C-alpha cells in the first residue's frame, strides 16, 4: 500500500552531451541518456530527474541563480524544469538540432547554437505563474556559413563568441546599439575552431582549433584592429582537440584530445600545469568549477566521469558505468549496497547512499548471469557463462574461491544455502543442478530429474529447501539436507521462467510463459493462488515488425519476479516496457510502471541481423529496507523509492485527531497521547516533532505504553530516521527502551518485525559501531603514549 516513484539511476554516470557544474560548485549535472543525473559532491549523494525526453539529451545548462535548468534532446525539443522543486515548467520545440545552449551570466537571456545560426531568447521568469507561451526570441544572428561548434558568454552579458566549422571565430553584441563595438570575424586557423573565450578584463580573446593551435587576439595599432599577437600550438603527435574550456579568473585552459588525454595550461604563458590520460577513448566534454578548483571530464564511449581537483591532485569523483546491460542485481542483506552484473563479465559493487561504485571485479571471462548474497552478507556469489561460479568476500574484496563443473557447463541461475555452506547452479544445456561445498569447493553431487533446462533456483531462507523450475513445465522441491533426500515435483500448465521464494519460506511463486504468476504451498505442494498478467503487460511494436502489437506475442510474460519482504506484494518484469506490482493475497495489480519513454528504444512504443537496442528488464528486487525496489534494464539500474511520502494516509483517524491537538498534547506534556495521535495522522513532520520533543526521562514510560499496533510503525520510523540523523545517542536511548519494553513481543512475531529490526541493525552496525570503534582506539592509543617510556 505504498506509492513508488523513480528516484535515481545507478550504473550510468555519463552518456553524452555536456556536463555542467552548479553555480555553487557543490553539484554536478551529467546527462545520462534520456534523463539528467545530479551528483552532490560535497554531501556525496545523487538523484535523477523524473522528467524524460523523447530522445537522448544533447545539451543542458543551469542558470547561475540555480533555479532554472534547460535540457535539449537531439531533435531540438527542449524542456525547462524548476531545479529547486524538480518539476517540469515548460516544453518548447526549437525544430532544429541545437549543438549547445548557455544561459547568460545575468540569467535574463540564453543563447542557442542551431546549425549555422545563433538564436538568442529571453529566459522565462520562474517566480511568475505558469505561462502558455513564455519563450520570446530576442534576436537571431546569421553570420556563419557552417555549423557552430560552441558559444561563450562575456562576463558582462554584452558579447558572445561563436566558433564554427568555417575556421572562423566570430563575435556579436547582445545590444543592438553595441553592434559597432563587436562585429568582427576572426580568421587564421587551419582547422575547425573549437573554442573562443574572453580574458578576465575582456581585452584579450583566445581561440583554439582542432589542429591544436591557440591564437591570442589583442586590439592594437598596426588604425587599431584585432591581431594575433601570440600563437601557441599543442604538439600532440596525432590527437585532435575535442573539447576546450577556459576559466578567466584563474586563467586555466583545460583541453581534452581525441586520444583520451587532457592537458591543463596557464594562459597566456602556455605553461603545462599537468597532463593525464583517462584511457584510449576520446574526451568528449570538459567543465570547470565556478571557483576553478574542480575539473569535470567525460568520455562517452565507456561512460567515464571524472572530477579532478588540480589544486591537490585529488579525485572528488571517479566512476565508470557498465558497457553492457545489467543482467542481474542483488541487494546486500541490510540494503546498504547493491551488486550489479553485466554481459561484459564485470561485477560492480554500488553504495545506495552515495550511489557510487566501490569496487569492480573483472575475473569472469564471459557474461555474469546471476549474483546472490549469503544470509550473513559478507560473502557474495556469482555465476557466469564462461563456466565458473565464484565466491567474493566483500569485507576484503577478494575472490576466495571458484567453483566449476567437470565439463565446463554454462551456468544461468544460482542459489545459496542460508547457512552459506552449499551452492547450487543451473544450466540451459545440462538439465542437472550442480551442488558444491563452499568450504571445500568440491562437487557434492548433481541433482537430477528435470527433463528440461533449469531456468531458476532458490533456497528457503528459513526451511532451507531448494525449489527449482524448468522448461519441463514442472517445479521440484528438493530436501537435500538431512539423512534422506526427497523430491516433490509439481506440474504447471506452461514453462516456468522465473521463481521467487516467500521470505517465511512457506510458499513459492512462479512466472510462466502463459503470463501467469502461480503461488504454491511448499509443505502441501498445492496451488494456493494465481494472477493473470498478459493483459497488464505493455509491449510496443518494434520498428522492424510486420505484425501489430496487439497480435504480437513476443513478450507477454514476466522473466523476473520477487516478493516483498512483508510477503504481500510481487514486483515483476520482463522483456517489455512495463514493471507490474501485484498484491499476492487479493491478486490485483497495485501499480504499473513504464520502464522507458525513449523513442530510440525499439519496444517503447540474409546474413545481416536487423538489431537495435530494446527496452527490457533483466532483474528486479525489493530493497530489504522495504522502501524501494531496483530494476535492472538496458539503460541502467532504475530505483523506485517511497521516500518522498507526500500522500496523506491516516491510520484510524478521528475527528478529535488534528495536528493542532497533537501540538497541544505536547504543550500539556501528554507525550504518549501526542505520539499516538501523530502516528494516527501518519505525518512524518508531526511524528518527527513529537519524537524529538519527548524528554529522556519520559522515554521509558512512553516506550512501555505504546500500543502493539503502532510498534512496527515506530520501529520502522526510528531505523530509517536514525541512519541519516545526527542524534545518535537519542536514537539509541529510544531503541534500548523499545527493545527492553517490547523485546518479548518482537520475538513472538519475528516475521512482523523483520524489516523494522533489520533497519535498526543497519544503523547500529554501519554508523554507530564506526563511532565507538574510533573512540575506543584513541583510548588505547592514549594509554600507550602516556604509560610507556618515551623515546631517547
Amino acid at each position: 500500500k505504498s506509492d513508488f516513484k523513480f528516484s535515481n539511476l545507478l550504473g550510468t554516470v555519463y552518456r553524452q552531451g555536456n556536463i555542467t557544474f552548479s553555480d555553487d560548485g557543490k553539484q554536478l549535472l551529467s546527462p545520462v541518456g534520456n534523463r539528467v543525473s545530479v551528483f552532490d559532491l560535497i554531501n556525496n549523494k545523487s538523484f535523477t530527474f523524473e522528467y524524460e525526453h523523447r530522445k537522448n539529451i544533447a545539451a543542458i545548462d543551469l542558470n547561475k541563480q540555480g533555479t532554472l535548468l534547460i535540457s535539449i534532446d537531439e531533435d531540438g525539443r527542449a524542456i525547462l524544469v524548476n531545479f529547486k522543486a524538480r518539476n517540469v515548467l515548460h516544453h518548447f520545440n526549437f525544430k532544429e538540432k541545437c549543438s549547445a545552449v548557455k544561459f547568460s551570466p545575468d540569467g535574463r537571456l540564453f543563447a542557442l547554437a542551431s546549425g549555422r545560426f545563433l538564436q538568442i531568447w529571453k529566459t522565462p521568469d520562474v517566480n511568475k505563474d505558469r505561462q502558455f507561451a513564455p519563450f520570446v526570441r530576442h534576436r537571431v544572428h546569421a553570420g556563419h556559413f557552417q555549423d557552430i561548434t560552441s558559444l561563450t558568454w562575456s562576463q558582462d552579458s554584452r558579447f558572445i563568441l561563436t566558433t564554427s566549422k568555417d575556421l572562423s571565430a566570430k563575435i556579436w553584441s547582445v545590444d543592438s546599439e553595441e553592434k559597432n563595438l563587436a562585429a568582427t570575424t576572426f580568421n587564421g586557423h587551419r582547422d575547425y575552431v573549437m573554442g573562443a573565450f574572453f580574458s578576465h578584463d575582456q581585452e584579450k580573446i583566445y581561440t583554439v582549433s582542432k589542429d591544436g593551435a591557440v591564437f591570442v587576439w589583442e586590439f592594437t595599432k598596426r588604425k587599431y584592429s584585432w591581431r594575433i599577437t601570440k600563437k601557441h600550438f599543442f604538439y600532440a603527435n596525432q590527437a585532435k582537440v575535442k573539447c576546450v574550456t577556459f576559466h578567466p579568473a584563474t586563467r586555466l585552459l583545460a583541453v581534452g584530445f581525441t586520444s583520451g588525454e587532457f592537458r591543463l595550461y596557464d594562459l597566456p604563458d602556455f605553461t603545462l600545469i599537468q597532463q593525464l590520460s583517462m584511457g584510449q577513448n576520446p574526451v568528449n566534454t570538459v567543465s570547470v568549477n565556478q571557483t576553478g578548483e574542480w575539473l569535470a571530464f567525460g568520455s562517452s564511449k565507456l561512460g567515464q566521469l571524472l572530477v579532478y581537483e588540480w589544486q591537490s591532485e585529488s579525485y572528488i569523483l571517479k566512476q565508470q558505468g557498465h558497457f553492457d546491460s545489467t543482467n542481474s542485481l542483488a541487494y546486500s542483506p541490510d540494503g546498504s549496497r547493491v551488486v550489479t552484473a553485466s554481459e561484459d563479465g564485470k561485477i560492480k559493487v554500488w553504495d545506495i547512499t552515495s550511489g557510487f561504485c566501490l569496487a569492480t571485479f573483472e575475473e569472469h571471462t564471459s557474461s555474469v548471469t546471476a549474483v546472490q548474497f549469503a544470509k550473513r552478507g559478507q560473502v557474495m556469489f556469482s555465476s557466469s557463462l564462461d563456466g565458473t561460479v565464484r565466491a567474493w568476500d566483500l569485507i576484503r574484496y577478494r575472490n576466495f574461491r571458484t567453483f566449476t563443473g567437470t565439463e565446463r557447463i554454462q551456468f544461468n541461475c544460482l542459489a545459496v544455502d542460508p547457512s552459506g555452506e552449499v551452492v547450487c547452479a543451473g544450466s540451459l544445456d545440462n538439465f542437472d543442478i550442480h551442488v558444491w561445498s563452499v568450504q571445500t569447493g568440491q562437487l557434492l553431487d548433481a541433482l537430477s530429474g528435470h527433463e528440461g533446462p533449469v531456468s531458476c533456483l532458490s533456497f528457503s531462507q528459513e526451511n532451507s529447501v531448494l525449489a527449482s523450475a524448468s522448461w519441463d513445465k514442472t517445479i521440484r522441491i528438493w530436501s537435500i539436507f538431512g539423512r534422506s533426500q526427497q523430491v516433490e515435483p509439481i506440474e504447471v500448465y506452461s514453462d516456468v521462467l522465473a521463481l521467487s521464494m516467500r521470505p517465511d519460506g512457506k510458499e513459492v511463486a512462479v512466472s510462466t510463459l502463459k503470463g501467469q504468476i502461480s503461488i504454491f504451498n511448499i509443505e502441501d505442494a498445492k496451488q494456493v493462488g494465481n494472477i493473470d498478467c498478459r493483459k497488464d503487460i505493455i509491449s510496443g511494436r518494434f520498428n522492424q515488425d510486420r505484425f501489430t502489437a496487439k497480435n504480437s506475442e513476443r513478450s507477454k510474460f514476466f522473466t523476473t519476479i520477487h516478493y516483498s519482504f512483508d510477503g504481500m506484494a510481487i514486483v515483476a518484469g520482463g522483456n517489455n516496457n512495463s514493471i507490474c506490482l501485484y498484491d499476492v493475497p487479493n491478486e490485483v495489480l497495485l501499480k504499473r510502471f513504464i520502464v522507458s519513454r525513449n523513442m530510440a528504444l525499439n519496444g517503447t512504443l540474409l546474413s545481416t541481423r536487423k538489431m537495435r537496442p530494446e527496452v527490457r528488464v533483466t532483474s528486479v528486487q525489493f530493497s530489504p529496507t522495504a522502501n524501494a525496489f531496483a530494476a535492472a534494464s538496458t539503460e541502467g539500474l532504475l530505483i523506485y523509492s517511497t521516500n518522498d511520502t507526500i500522500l496523506f494516509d491516516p491510520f484510524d483517524l478521528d475527528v478529535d485527531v488534528t495536528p493542532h491537538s497533537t501540538v497541544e498534547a505536547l504543550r500539556e506534556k501528554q507525550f504518549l497521547n501526542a505520539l499516538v495521535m501523530a502516528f494516527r495522522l501518519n505525518e512524518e513532520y508531526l511524528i518527527n516533532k513529537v519524537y524529538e520533543a519527548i524528554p529522556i526521562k519520559e522515554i521509558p514510560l512512553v516506550a512501555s505504553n505504546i500500543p502493539a499496533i503502532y510498534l512496527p510503525r515506530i520501529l520502522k520510523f526510528i531505523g530509517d530516521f536514525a541512519i541519516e540523523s545526527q542524534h545518535i545517542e537519542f536514537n539509541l536511548i529510544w531503541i534500548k527502551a523499545l527493545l527492553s519494553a517490547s523485546g518479548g513481543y518482537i520475538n513472538e512475531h519475528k516475521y512482523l518485525f523483520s524489516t523494522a529490526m533489520r533497519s535498526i541493525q543497519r544503523f547500529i552496525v554501519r554508523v554507530a559501531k564506526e563511532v565507538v570503534n574510533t573512540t575506543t582506539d584513541n583510548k588505547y592509543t592514549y594509554r600507550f603514549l602516556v604509560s610507556t617510556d618515551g623515546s631517547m
Binding site: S154, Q155, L181, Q202, E203, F219
Partner: peptide, 16 residues
C-alpha cells in the same frame, strides 16, 4: 582599449 572592454627584482646572484 579593446571594443569589448568592460563598461623589486630579486637578484639571482647568491653568495655560496
Amino acid at each position: 582599449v579593446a571594443p569589448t572592454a568592460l563598461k623589486d627584482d630579486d637578484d639571482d646572484v647568491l653568495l655560496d
